[PDB]
DNA sequence: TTTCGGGGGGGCCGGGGGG
DNA sequence: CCCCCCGGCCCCCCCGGC
DNA sequence: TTAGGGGGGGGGA
DNA sequence: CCCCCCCCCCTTT
């Protein structure tokens, strides 16, 4: 811990204020309005990984309390003990006692509350209800089915969406300004495509790309750099493989698949996912074709998840695609 | 705060009295009258009966307008009493139709007052009448020695047998690990009469009792230097400790022959 | 800002038995009991946010009055309620002496009693039986089955039904008049629709909508309250064309950030409750959904697996 | 002193029985208990070895069991008071662990009552130890259930135990130590007078024709019936047919079914029809499974071949439906293995419910052709575990000499060992003893290993009849010779 | 039956304090 | 110097879905 | 619609 | 009085 420059980019660029959280404008505006007029309710931030839930709640705590928010809030996460005993003693004591430093209300942040036991969640009900005059609760989750209905009944729900293109673009621009980096438009589009709405993936991939450049001060991050660092197929490779599968005979398709994979050592699963993405846009005359494609490719992906013979799996992909598309004629 | 006002000049006396029988009976009814306080309690096993008498002379400014009954749990009372001090004076205050009793610890040297309230219990235990009975054996012995023998014998068996014959007292305990015996004879010393073991045996006696009950009984040894044991042929054994103006008695039913 | 506005679920929490809506017959029975006393041991059961704790507290207050502070012992899941507690604290409270009017008793309120251990429940039996002349017990729970049968035998059963849209609307209108909230009929309809009979949820959503947008109309309500995903899942499963179901899955669930595990669990529940489909077809659907659920739990949680599940469901339905 | 007005008391207390004759139903059980406690003294005089006409003279403890609210505690206290005994009562509110049991009631088993002595019947000085709610104690050893069972064998004073479920595993130690007295649900006729008297005293109208319904609502729980009357009369002063249905539905006692009842209900074809499935929904069937999720799948797998189906699809034979059900049961077994793995995927329990129970039952639902049988898988599993333990012991005795695993020992070596260990006795009589012992010494085998080996064979090579047919003299000589020599040890502990 | 993990309840052990 | 109170491990039994 | 078989108890030719 | 009706309860780790 010698300097912030020694941190991974996923942590070096953690938002410190609500103005640095992108892609969640509705939620940020609503919560800021709540805080401004002193109408903060019990909150439930629900969303997928790397969308800004923990960042948003920490920034909200800083806004409410300032720089010394750490001693003014009670933060518990999945790495801490949160059994029913903790609810009965520590949370209850914090919720029923005044602040040491100021006279303001009290904030309890139950990060990753979907990992809490059912007994603790049930015990939380009357703690939340009884001390609502002076205490507020925030619950963060990725899986809503692990939350008891009683807890959900007491909370106001905010859903964090997968990050849109514009927010990722703006954060990438800020990171490029800070790091003195150059990025090509095609490389940026590929980075957004592989992000899948998760900012952590964007930051990690960008850090790897910078590490890849021979002279990062002068070399620009091209799509080739991204595909090399991530070891992912190019769109042209996927197009060629799909065209060979759908047009050529078995020998040619097998040869083309093996050659494309061997050129850069691509993984079969990445090719399967890319081809599935491409095929979703294809207009099919028969529903049976789509049914066969989906079922067979899902089976192949499940088989790959456990290992198995790579060559047989590739041949299975080829055969499944051909057999499914033979249903488009009659 | 005037119906009943009973002042002990020392709070240690009442605390010791309670500790004498707090390990055997939980809920106790204290009947306070112009003549003093009387209590009677039956243990959970219904084989050990505790009787307590506290005379007015034991108090300092005892006063009772009309007879009152106070049902108390001894655990709560002991917890309250441990907050006092031996030098402090302890006054019990009760009113008409009382739902609670006030315990007042006062310090004369200082100006510190400690007032406590204890919620009374609704106890519906019947009061049994103990009529004077002529026992065939009566032995007075030092409380410390009796406690020592009882504790030593309880280490071997769950029951202890007491046999009394002409100038001879025998305590036996036979269990699984082994057996133990202790024999004493009456003795008197003018220089140290307080250790004089005295025996009056109208007829020979032989009885058996549970070890746990005797262990509970011997906890009253802290109240009197001596202990008096009265035994009959087929009647409960009476273990009595004398107080300044009262008594603590344990009637223990023996084990069936 | 370091100040908090008291939630309306607490500010307008009913204080008397006449302010509670729904379950009219049971509320009148409670009112009569409070009138004439002689409260028996009771178990109140029902779904969340319908006024069980409110009912019990109002009954206790109206029965005891000034003696409430001394004649009521409240224990819930946030307090220690082990066998030791039952054997010592509750027993001491039951044995305690308290002068009460000629037709009143002490009350023990065991809220969320379904979480109590079987040992404590067993210990409560003879305590209830022996001290019934001075103490009475009120249990509140969501699942009465968790209460052991011996305890159910000694109590009066009160099963609370769900609140109808009319009672919810009445209470919301009362609160709106008290708060001078500006609204539109569509807004209240949306609030009731999203509440699903939960008065607490309805009031919380109303307050949040007012705080965040001021005007309670359809748009603001749906911005604050999201359309329940079970309905979206039902629409996905009931679609006739595989393309339509896939479109719903991709656009209304996957792109909104709903996790695959949540989607599959909700699909299982909705399929179980799909009374409009033949039971055998539902069983086949459940088999396929369970296959997908096992795959997801194994770690393969992807859009492709869910799409394959939908394809298999459509193949079954054809 | 302040007394409690009768108007303040619960109806159950206000109308509690005062003597044994007011107890409604179970007259035979009450008489049996009363006679047992009346002749307990004579049974003691005979050292509890002479059994009378009723056969209760050999029991020092009585065990009353039945469903809730039928008069067990009332009857016990009434019999104890009628005969003049002093009652020492314990219940679930008290600590009855082994330590407390030995330090508490243990000393009262052969002790006189101080109360019984200061209140003076010849039995007044003797105790009657009533242990109520025996099923309310948890634990295997520290709970003290076995300690109470031990007490029941040596108590010097009458002891009455009361529980609700007599067939629970925890009750096993009380197998044949106490006189078992069963209290059954009292019928409507045995109580109708009681409810009519309560109605006329309480000034509310009750129609007799609905009493049978009311009991059906309470499942024979008289206490619950009285509570229902007290609660309903607060607002509805007349109980008739115009309101019986709603009251019954609101107050219905929903008790979890037992495995036999679960199997009977799940395999009934009616619930799988359109109307039946609309009345008994799939959710209800899953809940029925969850009544006992450990035993329901075993019950279904045990009884799914013993039905006459009424849900057969056209052109479908009973065998084909059975095959489909068996396939689904196999899938359910796979899911069960997943649930109990290191990942602890208990969230899969509902799916299991469908695969193990609901689906195969829907495939073979109908009418039970014969009696419903308890699952035989548990006993077979225990027997297999025992045989595998014996096989492992034999294998590690013979490990030094053989070259194989235990499975190979069972499948290959054992027949030849049979030929070289058992056959000689059947051919040469005693003259073969030495040879057999020699073979045993060559493989470090003992007599117990010999018997265990003989216990493994199946089919035509069963040995029980052959072994029993051997002359007793040959076996006696074999044992004598084996005990008259020194033998080696394969494993030195 | 039973492959983690949480929760509860009861039994000893031992530090500290008091006498 | 010895006995008693009361905090802390340690062991053992029991769910685990809605 | 009642799985088979045993126990209990009110009614009665 | 034995027989019947009628119901309940046990099969079960
Ligand atoms: N909306 C966002 N704006 C800017 N950076 C973000 C945003 N979301 C995620 N990040 C970045 O990714 C990192 C992690 O963000 P988090 O707030 O922790 O996401 P999260 O939703 O809490 O992840 P989970 O639910 O614990 S897996 C941040 O430090 C940021 O660097
Ligand atoms: N019938 C009702 N009438 C008026 N307000 C109600 C009603 N039910 C619930 N509420 C409101 O919602 C709030 C919570 O009601 P509760 O009584 O706590 O519901 P609950 O059934 O006890 O919730 P659970 O079972 O503990 S999750 C009340 O303070 C009221 O403001
Ligand atoms: N045969 C009966 N006749 C009249 N009243 C009964 C009868 N059985 C139970 N009751 C009533 O229900 C109350 C409780 O009876 P109990 O003797 O406690 O039954 P129980 O079988 O011991 O119930 P459990 O095992 O403690 S749940 C009695 O005071 C009566 O008011
Ligand atoms: Mg986070
Ligand atoms: Mg509640
Ligand atoms: Mg009972």
**Final residue belonging to a domain, choices C147, C163, C179:** C163
Please tell me the number of Cα atoms within 13 Å of D91 on its side-chain side.
Answer: 16
Give pairs for D39-47: CB < 8 Å, separation 24+: D40/D158, D41/D123, D44/D156
- How many secondary structure helices (H) and strands (E) does chain B include? 4, 18
Continuous segment of H or E residues that includes residue A306: none
CA distance A248 to A201: 37
Does chain D reach chain B with at least 3 CB pairs under 8 Å? yes
Which chain H nucleotides are covered by protein, judged by CB under 7 A?
A: 7-13
B62 phi and psi, to 5 degrees?
Answer: -60, 135
Q: Which residues contact D472 (CB under 8 A, 6 or more apart)?
A: none
**Final residue belonging to a domain, choices C122, C144, C163:** C163
Is D136 near strand G, with its CB below 7 A from some atom of it? no
Q: Which residues contact A312 (CB under 8 A, 6 or more apart)?
A: none
Q: Give distance CA D26 / C1' G8 (Å).
A: 9
Inter-chain CB proximity D272 and C273 less than 8 Å: no
B198 phi and psi, to 5 degrees?
Answer: -115, 135
Show residues of chain D in contact with C144, CB under 8 Å. 254
Does chain A reach chain B with at least 3 CB pairs under 8 Å? no
Helix, strand, coil % over all residues of chain A, rounded to 5: 60, 10, 30
> Ligand 5 centroid vs D73 CA: distance in angstroms?
35
* Nearest Cα residue to A17 out of A51, A77, A76, A61: A61
Q: Give distance CA C92 / C1' F5 (Å).
A: 23
Shortest distance, CA D9 to any CA of chain C (angstroms):
6
B16 phi and psi, to 5 degrees?
Answer: -65, -40
Ligand 6 ion: residues within 5 Å (CB)? D 73
* Nearest Cα residue to D440 out of D420, D426, D456, D455: D420
CA distance B147 to B153: 10
Give me the residue from C97, C98, C134 closest to B71, CB to CB.
C97
Q: Which residues pair with B70 in a beta bridge?
A: B30
Q: Which residues of D75-113 are buried (b: 16+ CB within 10 A; e: fewer)?
A: bbbbbbeebebbbbbbbbbbbbbbeebeebbbbbbbbbb
Give me the residue from B27, B71, B99 closest to C98, CB to CB.
B99
Cα nearest neighbour of A283 on chain C: C243
For D265, other C-beta atoms within 10 Å of its C-beta total 16
- Is residue C286 within 8 A of residue D354, CB to CB? The reply is yes
Helix, strand, coil % over all residues of chain C, rounded to 5: 60, 10, 30
- Is residue D226 within 8 A of residue D68, CB to CB? The reply is no
Q: Are residues C7 and C151 in the same domain?
A: yes
Best residue among C199, C204, C205 to mutate for probing ligand 2's pocket (most ligand atoms within 8 Å of CB) is: C199
CA distance B47 to B237: 11
> Ligand 3 centroid vs D72 CA: distance in angstroms?
7
Inter-chain CB proximity B120 and C97 less than 8 Å: yes
Nucleotide nearest to D286 (CA to C1'): F17
Answer whether C65 contacts ligand 2 (Cβ < 6 A): no
Inter-chain CB proximity D7 and C87 less than 8 Å: no
Answer whether A50 contacts ligand 1 (Cβ < 6 A): yes
Q: How many domains does chain C have?
A: 3
Please tell me the number of Cα atoms within 13 Å of C80 on its side-chain side.
Answer: 11
C48 assigned binding-site residue? yes
Inter-chain CB proximity C126 and D254 less than 8 Å: no
CA distance C40 to C33: 9
Q: Are residues C250 and C149 in the same domain?
A: no
CA distance A58 to A75: 10
**Final residue belonging to a domain, choices C188, C204, C227:** C227
Answer whether D297 contacts ligand 3 (Cβ < 6 A): no
Q: Are residues C65 and C200 in the same domain?
A: no
Q: Could you tell me which chains touch chain A, where touching means 3 or more CB pairs under 8 A?
A: C
CA-CA-CA-CA torsion sign (B140, B141, B147, B151):
negative
Q: Are residues C76 and C185 in the same domain?
A: no
Answer whether D123 contacts ligand 3 (Cβ < 6 A): no
Q: Which residues pair with B165 in a beta bridge?
A: B168
CA distance D40 to D178: 13
Answer whether C14 contacts ligand 2 (Cβ < 6 A): yes
3-class DSSP state of D370: coil
Q: Are residues C25 and C143 in the same domain?
A: yes
CA distance C6 to D339: 45
Q: Could you tell me which chains touch chain C, where touching means 3 or more CB pairs under 8 A?
A: A, B, D
Q: Is C138 exposed, middle or buried (0-12, 13-18, 19+ CB in 10 A)?
A: buried
CA distance D307 to B79: 69
Q: Which residues of A292-302 are buried (b: 16+ CB within 10 A; e: fewer)?
A: bbbbbbbebbb
Please tell me the number of Cα atoms within 13 Å of A174 on its side-chain side.
Answer: 16
Binding residues of D for ATP: 12, 24, 66-74, 164
Which chain G nucleotides are covered by protein, judged by CB under 7 A?
A: 1-5, 8-10
Is D261 near strand H, with its CB below 7 A from some atom of it? yes
Domain extents for chain A? 1-163, 164-232, 233-330
CA distance B144 to A84: 50
CA-CA-CA-CA torsion sign (D128, D133, D135, D139):
negative
Cα nearest neighbour of D1 on chain B: B97
Q: Which residues contact D408 (CB under 8 A, 6 or more apart)?
A: none
Q: Give distance CA D139 / C1' E2 (Å).
A: 19
- Is residue B12 within 8 A of residue B95, CB to CB? The reply is no
- Is residue D489 within 8 A of residue D444, CB to CB? The reply is yes
Cα nearest neighbour of B124 on chain C: C95
Shortest distance, CA D157 to any CA of chain B (angstroms):
10
Size of chain A in residues: 330
- Is residue B122 within 8 A of residue C95, CB to CB? The reply is yes
CA distance B15 to C137: 36
Please tell me the number of Cα atoms within 13 Å of B92 on its side-chain side.
Answer: 26
Q: Are residues C278 and C172 in the same domain?
A: no
Shortest distance, CA A2 to any CA of chain C (angstroms):
35
Q: Are residues C168 and C293 in the same domain?
A: no
Containing structural domain, residue C189: 164-227
Shortest distance, CA C102 to any CA of chain A (angstroms):
32
D141 phi and psi, to 5 degrees?
Answer: -120, -50
Is C78 an interface residue toward D (CB < 8 Å)?
no
* Helix ranges (DSSP H) in C3-45: 8-11, 24-36
Q: Are residues C16 and C86 in the same domain?
A: yes
Answer whether C77 contacts ligand 2 (Cβ < 6 A): no
Cα torsion D376, D379, D382, D388 to 10°: value is -70
Q: Are residues C15 and C132 in the same domain?
A: yes
Size of interface B-C (CB pairs under 8 A): 22
* Method in brief: cryo-EM
- Is residue D456 within 8 A of residue D387, CB to CB? The reply is yes
Which of D2, D94, D111, D156 is the mutation pick for testing B, counting most B CBs within 10 A?
D111
Give me the residue from D112, D114, D115 closest to B256, CB to CB.
D112
Residues with CB under 7 A from strand E: A 83-85, 117, 119-120; C 82-84, 117, 119-120; D 95, 97-100, 142, 294, 298, 337, 340-342, 344, 377-378, 381
3-class DSSP state of A272: helix
- Is residue D264 within 8 A of residue D368, CB to CB? The reply is yes
A54 assigned binding-site residue? yes
- Is residue A228 within 8 A of residue A222, CB to CB? The reply is no
Which chain F nucleotides are covered by protein, judged by CB under 7 A?
A: 12-18
Cα nearest neighbour of B129 on chain D: D118
Shortest distance, CA D94 to any CA of chain B (angstroms):
10
Residues with CB under 7 A from strand F: A 118, 145; C 118, 143, 265, 269; D 138-142, 170, 290, 293, 344, 346-347, 349-350
Continuous segment of H or E residues that includes residue D441: helix D433-442
């Amino acid at each position: 811990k010698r300097s912030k420059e020694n941190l991974p980019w996923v942590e070096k660029y953690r938002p410190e204020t609500l103005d640095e959280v992108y892609g969640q404008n509705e939620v940020i505006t609503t919560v800021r309005k709540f805080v401004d007029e002193g109408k903060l309710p019990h909150l439930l931030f629900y969303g997928p990984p790397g969308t800004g839930k923990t960042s948003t709640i920490v920034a909200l705590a800083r806004e409410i309390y300032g720089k010394n928010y750490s001693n003014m809030v009670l933060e518990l996460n999945a790495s801490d003990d949160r059994g029913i005993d903790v609810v009965r003693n520590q949370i209850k004591d914090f919720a029923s006692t005044r602040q040491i430093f100021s006279k303001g209300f009290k904030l309890i942040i139950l990060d990753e509350a979907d990992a809490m036991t059912n007994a603790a969640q049930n015990a939380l009900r009357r703690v939340i209800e009884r001390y609502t005059k002076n205490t507020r609760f925030c619950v963060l989750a990725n899986y809503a089915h692990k939350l008891t209905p009683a807890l959900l009944s007491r909370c106001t729900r905010f859903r964090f969406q997968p990050l849109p293109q514009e927010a990722i673009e703006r954060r990438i621009a800020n990171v490029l300004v800070h790091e003195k980096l150059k990025l090509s438009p095609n490389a940026e589009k590929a980075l957004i495509e592989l992000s899948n709405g998760d900012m952590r993936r964007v930051l990690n991939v960008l850090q790897s790309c910078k590490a890849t450049l021979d002279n990062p001060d002068e070399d620009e991050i091209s799509d080739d750099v991204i595909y090399e660092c991530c070891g992912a197929p190019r769109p042209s490779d996927l197009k060629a493989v799909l065209k060979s599968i759908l047009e050529d005979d078995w020998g040619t398709a097998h040869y083309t698949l093996n050659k494309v994979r061997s050129a850069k050592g691509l993984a079969l699963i990445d090719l399967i996912e890319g081809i599935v993405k491409i095929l979703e846009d294809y207009e099919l005359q028969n529903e049976e074709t789509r049914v066969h494609l989906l079922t067979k490719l899902a089976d192949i992906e499940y088989s790959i998840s456990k290992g198995g013979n790579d060559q047989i799996q590739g041949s299975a992909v080829i055969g499944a695609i051909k057999a499914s598309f033979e249903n488009e004629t009659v | 705060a005037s119906m009943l006002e009973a002042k002990f000049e020392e709070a240690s006396l009442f605390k010791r009295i309670i500790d004498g029988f707090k390990d055997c009976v939980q809920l106790v009814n204290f009947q306070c009258k112009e003549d003093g306080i009387i209590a009677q309690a039956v243990d959970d096993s219904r084989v050990l009966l505790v009787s307590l008498e506290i005379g007015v002379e034991a108090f300092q400014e005892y006063r009772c307008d009309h007879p009152v009954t106070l049902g108390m749990d001894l655990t709560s009372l002991s917890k309250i009493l441990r907050c006092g001090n031996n030098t402090d004076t302890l006054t019990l205050i009760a009113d008409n139709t009382p739902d609670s009793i006030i315990l007042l610890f006062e310090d004369t040297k200082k100006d510190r007052i400690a007032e406590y309230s204890l919620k009374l219990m609704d106890i519906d235990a019947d009061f049994l009448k103990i009529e004077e009975l002529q026992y065939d054996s009566t032995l007075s012995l030092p409380s410390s020695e009796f406690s020592k023998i009882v504790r030593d014998l309880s280490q071997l068996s769950d029951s202890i047998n007491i046999m009394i014959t002409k100038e001879t007292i025998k305590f036996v305990a036979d269990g699984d690990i082994g057996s133990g015996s202790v024999i004493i004879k009456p003795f008197v010393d003018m220089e140290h009469p307080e250790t004089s073991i005295k025996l009056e045996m109208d007829q020979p006696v032989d009885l058996t009792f549970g070890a746990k009950y005797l262990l509970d009984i011997i906890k009253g040894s802290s109240l009197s230097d001596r202990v008096g044991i009265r035994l009959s042929s087929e009647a409960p054994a009476l273990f009595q400790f004398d107080l300044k103006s009262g008594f603590l008695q344990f009637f223990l039913a023996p084990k069936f022959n | 800002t370091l100040s908090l506005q008291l939630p309306w679920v607490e500010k307008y929490r009913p204080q008397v038995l006449s302010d509670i809506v729904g379950n009219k017959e049971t509320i009148d029975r409670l009112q009569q009991i409070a009138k004439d006393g002689n409260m028996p041991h009771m178990i109140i059961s029902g779904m969340p946010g319908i006024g069980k704790t409110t009912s019990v507290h109002c009954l206790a207050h109206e029965l005891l009055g000034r003696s409430y502070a001394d004649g009521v012992l409240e224990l819930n899941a946030s307090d220690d309620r082990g066998i030791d507690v039952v054997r010592n604290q509750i027993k001491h409270f039951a044995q305690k002496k308290l002068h009460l009017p000629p037709g009143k008793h002490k009350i023990v309120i065991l809220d969320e009693a379904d979480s109590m251990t079987a040992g404590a429940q067993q210990a409560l039996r003879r305590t209830m039986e022996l001290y019934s002349n001075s103490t009475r017990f009120a249990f509140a729970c969501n699942q009465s089955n968790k209460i052991i049968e011996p305890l159910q035998s000694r109590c009066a059963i009160l099963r609370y039904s769900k609140l109808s849209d009319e009672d919810v609307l009445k209470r919301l209108l009362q609160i709106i008049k008290l708060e001078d909230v500006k609204y539109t009929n569509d807004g209240l309809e949306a609030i009731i629709f999203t509440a699903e009979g939960d008065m607490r949820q309805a009031i919380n959503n109303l307050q949040s909508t007012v705080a965040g947008h001021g005007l309670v109309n359809a748009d603001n309500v749906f911005k604050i309250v999201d359309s329940p995903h079970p309905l979206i899942v039902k629409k996905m499963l009931l679609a006739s064309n595989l393309e339509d179901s896939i479109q719903i899955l991709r656009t209304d669930l996957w792109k909104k950030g709903y996790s695959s595990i949540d989607i599959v669990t909700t699909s299982f529940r909705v399929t179980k409750n799909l009374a409009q489909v033949k039971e055998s077809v539902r069983l086949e659907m459940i088999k396929e959904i369970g296959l997908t659920h096992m795959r997801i739990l194994e770690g393969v949680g992807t859009y492709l697996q869910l799409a394959s599940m939908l394809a298999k469901i459509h193949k079954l339905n054809n | 002193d302040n007394v409690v007005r009768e108007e303040d008391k619960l109806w159950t207390v206000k109308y509690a029985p005062t003597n044994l004759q007011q107890v409604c139903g179970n007259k035979g059980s009450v008489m049996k208990l009363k006679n047992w406690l009346a002749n307990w003294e004579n049974s003691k005089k005979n050292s509890f070895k002479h059994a009378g006409k009723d056969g209760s003279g050999v029991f020092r403890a009585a065990m009353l069991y039945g469903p809730p609210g039928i008069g067990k505690t009332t009857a016990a206290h009434l019999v104890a008071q009628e005969l003049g005994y002093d009652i020492l009562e314990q219940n679930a509110s008290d600590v009855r662990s082994k330590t407390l049991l030995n330090a508490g009631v243990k000393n009262a088993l052969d002790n006189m009552s101080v109360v019984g002595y200061f209140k003076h019947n010849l039995n007044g000085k003797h105790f009657v130890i009533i242990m109520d709610e025996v099923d309310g104690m948890s634990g295997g050893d520290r709970g003290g259930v076995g300690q109470l069972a031990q007490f029941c064998r040596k108590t010097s004073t009458p002891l009455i135990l009361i529980c609700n479920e007599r067939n629970l595993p925890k009750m096993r130690p009380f197998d044949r130590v106490c006189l078992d007295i069963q209290f059954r649900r009292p019928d409507a006729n045995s109580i109708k007078s009681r409810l009519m008297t309560i109605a006329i005293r309480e000034k509310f109208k009750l129609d007799p024709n609905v009493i049978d319904r009311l009991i059906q609502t309470t499942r024979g729980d008289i206490r619950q019936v009285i509570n229902l009357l007290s609660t309903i009369s607060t607002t509805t002063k007349t109980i008739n047919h115009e309101n019986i249905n709603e009251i019954s539905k609101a107050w219905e006692k929903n008790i979890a079914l037992k495995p036999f009842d679960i199997a009977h209900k799940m395999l009934d074809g009616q619930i799988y029809s359109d109307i039946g499935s609309r009345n008994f929904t799939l959710n209800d069937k899953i809940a029925l499974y969850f009544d006992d999720f450990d035993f329901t799948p075993l019950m279904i797998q045990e009884n799914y071949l013993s039905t006459r189906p009424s849900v057969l699809k056209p052109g479908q034979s009973h065998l084909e439906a059975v095959a489909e059900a068996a396939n689904c049961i196999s899938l359910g077994d796979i899911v069960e293995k997943k649930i109990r793995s290191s990942e602890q995927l208990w969230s899969l329990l509902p799916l299991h419910a469908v695969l193990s129970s609901v689906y195969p039952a829907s495939k073979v639902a109908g009418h039970m052709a014969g009696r419903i049988n308890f699952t035989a898988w548990l006993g077979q599993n225990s027997k297999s575990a025992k045989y595998y333990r014996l096989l492992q012991e034999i294998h590690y005795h013979t490990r030094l000499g053989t070259s194989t695993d235990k499975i190979g020992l069972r499948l290959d070596y054992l027949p030849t060992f049979r030929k070289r260990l058992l056959d000689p006795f059947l051919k040469q009589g005693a003259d073969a003893i030495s040879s057999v012992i020699e073979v045993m010494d060559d493989y470090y085998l003992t007599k117990e290993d010999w018997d265990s080996i003989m216990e493994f064979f199946v089919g035509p090579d069963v040995t029980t009849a052959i072994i029993k047919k051997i002359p007793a003299t040959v076996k006696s000589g074999f044992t004598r010779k084996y005990n008259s020599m020194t033998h080696p040890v394969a494993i030195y502990r």
